[PDB]
Amino acid sequence: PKDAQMMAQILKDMGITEYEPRVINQMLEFAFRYVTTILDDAKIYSSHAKKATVDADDVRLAIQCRADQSFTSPPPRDFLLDIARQRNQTPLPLIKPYSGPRLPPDRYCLTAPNYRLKSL
Amino acid sequence: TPLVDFLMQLEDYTPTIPDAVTGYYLNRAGFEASDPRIIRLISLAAQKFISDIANDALQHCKMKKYTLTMEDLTPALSEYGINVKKPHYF
Amino acid sequence: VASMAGVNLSEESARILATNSETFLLQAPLQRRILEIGKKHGITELHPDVVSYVSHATQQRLQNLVEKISETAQQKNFSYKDDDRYEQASDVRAQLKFFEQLDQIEKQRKDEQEREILMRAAKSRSRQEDPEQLRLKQKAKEMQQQELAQMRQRDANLTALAAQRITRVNLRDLIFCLENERETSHSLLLYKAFLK
Amino acid sequence: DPTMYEEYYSGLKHFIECSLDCHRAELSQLFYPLFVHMYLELVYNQHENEAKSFFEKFHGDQECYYQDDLRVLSSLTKKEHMKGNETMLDFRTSKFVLRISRDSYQLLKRHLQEKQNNQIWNIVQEHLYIDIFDGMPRSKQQIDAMVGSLAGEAKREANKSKVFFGLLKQDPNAPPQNRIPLPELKDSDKLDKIMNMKETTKRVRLGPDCLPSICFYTFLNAYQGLTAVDVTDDSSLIAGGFADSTVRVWSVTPKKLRSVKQASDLSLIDKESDDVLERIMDEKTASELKILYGHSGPVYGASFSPDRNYLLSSSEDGTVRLWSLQTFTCLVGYKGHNYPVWDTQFSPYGYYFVSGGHDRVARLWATDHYQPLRIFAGHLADVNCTRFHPNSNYVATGSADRTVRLWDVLNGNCVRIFTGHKGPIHSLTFSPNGRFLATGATDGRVLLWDIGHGLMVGELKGHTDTVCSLRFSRDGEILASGSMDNTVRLWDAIKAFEDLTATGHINLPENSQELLLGTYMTKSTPVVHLHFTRRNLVLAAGAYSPQ
């Protein structure tokens, strides 16, 4: 196909030699889902600005307002290094010698009487 | 306790989806088969969801019965807030 | 409202009956708050019906989150053991009570072993030099047994003289209602909340 | 400025390739960081056409080991594409370290302090550190051995901190026992070491002559993909983490897996009995296989505790789970990552554990707190591996930004940075001495690092695909390597450490051929785990994939 032969070149440019045949079919299904939610929001933004033609600033708005919600990322390095030094300053606690099975408080564990219904 | 009564009746009930298949997709998400009746209620809830979508789609087909087309699933899931996608790339 | 059979309509209508079965932001500091973010875009003045619309929008954001954390803060206040339609299946906590009793027994055993080692340190017909810890510490053991007797006669002398559930919402209930919704699932406010 | 970046970079490219060959191989190090820092500054200032032209003109003169980073960069053409990458966002703000000699830096600074090239000199002194050592300029096959990372080839001032790399109990390199608050040694834990030294009595000296026997424990069907294996310290249990969100414990000794009795059955028996543990076992529950459910995602880490209770597992759903091996249920779910936790490991003393995830940190937990104790947050990509030191005062975290970092458990400080891998590190192991560290990555290279000197001491380059499992022997005589080429290679881990600076590097020997004692090929089976029995017998586990 046309758009399915370009999908095998996006993977081969990323060095993916081996892949399942259903991999191309659902990256095209995601790419179709992504463009019919940019352009669906683009004509919502065009009707907000009251213009009959969806021009390039509408797609510039609908991309950056969908990328502000959908595609997130891990926390940044200046945020990870601040919560590290706030946590790594606290000294390590000592251990009670014969406390038993060392566990968190019981509202943080998964150890409850764990009931079930009576069969009748 | 209407639902507690129903789950107690769910022993001796065989659902449309098997418990070897409903229990497989529950084990995939961490839900382990402690009680068969609970697996059966989950199976029946999934069945009701698919059946309700199908019945709405049939009312749309009768308005425009017989064949279920993507243009029947499209207004049927639109009241659910679900925008279904055409394939369009095959 | 756009969807007549919408699926979040049936959620918060059945959630309220589950909690029944057990903000109005300040207009003066908010109007300065909108205008300062408007300097970064060129939105120099705002419409007079917006600062009360954002306050109605902030209310329905937190009321959709206060109702959501209330139906999981009452999920923990359902005691099964009062009902007898339910049966207990696996208690790890009573096994832990057994472990606590076993640990007390082990500590007693360790104390006995230490006493035996002290006695061995100078075993003779008569007390032997520095390691004669048996001569003094064993007398102290007898003194400790005499002290126990006290914890048993105080229980005896005083006997002779004699002769609407409240729901508290933890940070877990707020965290549980953040990783489920699509917004604030991968966010720096939930990621920091794992350390608070 | 931006339209003449292909004139600044090609001028410095013309100066370096016209230099003499002793300084040319060392001055070729600043081709890659000056190519990326000029390309990322073009796309951050919204100069896309010029960025695309620069990428096309200079991408093919970059070293072959950099193809993956080059492909991620070729995708990055917009500014907002790079504003949510968080690896090139941290590459743009950090400084490339670029260890060069003073004999070659004099030729570089005599070509940059002049006004003819004051623009590329302005990019160098803004985006590049330069760490100068007084010595010989390195060869090209020695520079190739120690570069490969992003913000790579770190300073010698990082690798000069005092590291207590010795074992606990005199050793001057050993930390005190009260440095890290380690747990007590119980009488059941002291009973374990009594039968452990009975196994050490039958332990064979391996060396280059008495090559060990390898017992492969293949997973035959495994149509749910096996993603994690661990074996206990005595070869008694084998755990399997699978892609169908299950952990499966197998007993390999002829002794079935039993759960302890329920609380009603324990209340009627008495304690203080000699049998006690035997009395508690339930015989109604006795299988050769126990399946553990509760992860909502593929289990990627698996770690036993040294007392043979307390299985650990981490998965894609962002939780680390502590499974009991006496009740065979889940106890705790440690939710600190929102992202796939790629590895976890218990401490060799069994109280603390470290888990590294997709969120580019490694957390230190203690099995007593719902929150971590130390956050090791200096990596620029995913923390793929997390390994404890044999004294458990130091945590080595390999990662996907081609660096290995040692972290002190006190203060959470990075005390060593080991760069020189070309792919993401997928295996770490420590020497039983505590002096050395073997790391493997996707380039098929096993790099042997010193820990006191912070210097790589050897390079083992026999493997072809990703080296996913390393272990040293119980004596330290042999390092075993298992990779995706379905081979278990054995390396001489005594002849590799025969020699024990201020130049911050040693001349690596190119001796891999003499350090290979043998290569054994698996039948279509990638060697996921490697384990050494206490009688020095190699165990290996891998799902058989016909492929």
Next chain:
Amino acid sequence: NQVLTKKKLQDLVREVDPNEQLDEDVEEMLLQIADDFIESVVTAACQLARHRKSSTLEVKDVQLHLERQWNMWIPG
């Protein structure tokens, strides 16, 4: 500077449950979530207003960001 006065938030809980008490940590996180919501909504609404070539930030702009990204549908 604080827009939510920590007492009207307690009336948002009393309307749902007459018998419920939040923790101080929960209240502070709820206040942070409110502050973050106000900031994100205003920034995107202002992006829509610049798009409509306006300096006025009318509700149409605030109402559009709720319906498309948050699905709130507050009556205007």
